Amino acid sequence: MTIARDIVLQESIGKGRFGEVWRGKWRGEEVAVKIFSSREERSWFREAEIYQTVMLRHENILGFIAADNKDNGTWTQLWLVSDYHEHGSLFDYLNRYTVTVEGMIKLALSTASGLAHLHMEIVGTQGKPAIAHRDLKSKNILVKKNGTCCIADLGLAVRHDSATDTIDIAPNHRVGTKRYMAPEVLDDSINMKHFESFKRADIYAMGLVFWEIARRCSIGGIHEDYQLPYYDLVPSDPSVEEMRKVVCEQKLRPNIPNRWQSCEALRVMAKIMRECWYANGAARLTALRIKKTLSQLSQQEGI
């Protein structure tokens, strides 16, 4: 099996909420290593616990390898090892490149497939609880070499037991990225005693990610430049109050350009976005419904 002792760190590649991400080499293979200090044990353990959930593995969820410790002789580092994806985040990918219609659908479908897998409860002996992400954003999705996505940063996730109707942790309010917070999270009206609330807040965030991808879809050399959702309405590093005034009070959502109505795939994406963006979480599409719509679209396009 893969163990920390056999891994050599090569390059710093990112900073998580807590813990730094490194590219490393293990038995002639590149891996990603997230490193936490001893004082970040609760965060490291929670992430190891989520990643070790029964039946979690899916092509659109970051592939977990091992939770380990490494003692350098002075202090102990807590490690989480996972698959390495050279392209980095969907945010990085979208800033660097434009995508074709086929490219856009692959990114959106793979994101929705990963989310539907997290959200779905799988019954049976090797059963999987339903899981809500709570920090979905383009900076937390990684892009693979084949042009498909995988959801990363599962540290803030919440897991549900449907039989006893319980959540595995006592969740704190407004934990994620402010820019991507659902309206009910921004105005703290979210009912955190009902698990469906967390899945519905993830859907809103996915609609924002879909908008980021669609902007980069190039047809006849025509596309928009890269932007974060609400780039036109809030400052860089927005506060909860700044987001709340825009999303809850003024009821604004990222702008849907005119050029998206001319393309069938762009019309389907724009419709999904609007149906992720209702203020009431119960009115939103489910990740399963979105996966089904994008699967039919990919089939008709011959992707």
Side-chain angles (χ1 to χ4, degrees), residues 10 35 42 46 61 96 126 165 178 225 235 238 260 283:
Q10 283 165 122
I35 305 175
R42 291 181 292 271
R46 179 51 177 179
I61 299 304
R96 195 164 163 167
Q126 296 301 324
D165 200 20
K178 295 168 174 65
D225 52 33
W260 299 3

Side-chain angles (χ1 to χ4, degrees), residues 274-285:
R274 296 181 200 108
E275 296 167 343
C276 292
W277 294 343
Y278 302 121
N280 188 342
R284 298 178 193 138
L285 289 167

Side-chain angles (χ1 to χ4, degrees), residues 140-144 146-153:
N140 281 342
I141 293 164
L142 299 164
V143 174
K144 295 198 193 174
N146 66 4
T148 67
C149 290
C150 70
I151 303 174
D153 199 10

Side-chain angles (χ1 to χ4, degrees), residues 12-14 16-77:
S12 166
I13 63 180
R17 260 179 323 279
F18 299 104
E20 246 270 338
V21 186
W22 293 79
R23 176 171 59 92
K25 183 138 59 108
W26 174 76
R27 283 201 212 164
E29 173 165 40
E30 297 303 304
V31 296
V33 176
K34 187 169 190 189
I35 305 175
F36 302 79
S37 59
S38 62
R39 66 168 169 189
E40 294 159 344
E41 198 186 77
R42 291 181 292 271
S43 290
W44 165 82
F45 183 81
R46 179 51 177 179
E47 207 177 325
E49 173 174 57
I50 298 304
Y51 271 101
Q52 288 174 54
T53 300
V54 169
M55 293 291 293
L56 181 61
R57 293 181 73 92
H58 186 275
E59 71 184 307
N60 310 121
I61 299 304
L62 178 61
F64 168 79
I65 294 171
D68 206 349
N69 297 3
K70 191 153 185 184
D71 185 345
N72 63 16
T74 304
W75 70 91
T76 294
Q77 287 182 337

Side-chain angles (χ1 to χ4, degrees), residues 125-144 146-172 174-192 194-257 259-260 262-274:
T125 63
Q126 296 301 324
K128 176 194 164 286
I131 305 171
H133 194 281
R134 294 201 300 160
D135 202 10
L136 190 65
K137 60 181 185 178
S138 63
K139 280 172 186 191
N140 281 342
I141 293 164
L142 299 164
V143 174
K144 295 198 193 174
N146 66 4
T148 67
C149 290
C150 70
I151 303 174
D153 199 10
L154 304 186
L156 289 170
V158 293
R159 302 184 296 180
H160 187 233
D161 188 12
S162 73
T164 62
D165 200 20
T166 55
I167 297 158
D168 65 342
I169 58 168
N172 281 320
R174 298 190 270 235
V175 297
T177 299
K178 295 168 174 65
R179 182 179 303 271
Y180 291 80
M181 284 179 183
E184 62 275 16
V185 171
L186 291 168
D187 70 10
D188 202 29
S189 64
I190 183 160
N191 185 353
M192 295 212 261
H194 287 146
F195 185 77
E196 200 54 40
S197 295
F198 301 103
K199 282 163 70 189
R200 288 160 181 176
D202 282 345
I203 296 301
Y204 166 88
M206 193 169 68
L208 302 182
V209 172
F210 276 19
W211 176 86
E212 292 173 71
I213 301 168
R215 279 189 69 91
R216 300 300 281 162
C217 180
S218 207
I219 305 151
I222 304 304
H223 57 265
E224 290 72 48
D225 52 33
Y226 174 85
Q227 295 294 347
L228 281 161
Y230 305 108
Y231 78 97
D232 49 355
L233 287 157
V234 303
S236 290
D237 200 24
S239 68
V240 164
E241 284 306 281
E242 281 159 2
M243 289 310 304
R244 193 191 54 76
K245 291 183 185 177
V246 173
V247 177
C248 304
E249 295 194 63
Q250 202 177 347
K251 303 184 193 305
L252 297 184
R253 293 300 184 269
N255 234 287
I256 296 156
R259 72 129 193 149
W260 299 3
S262 70
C263 169
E264 174 64 15
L266 285 172
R267 282 201 295 275
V268 173
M269 287 287 286
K271 183 164 190 288
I272 290 162
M273 290 170 215
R274 296 181 200 108

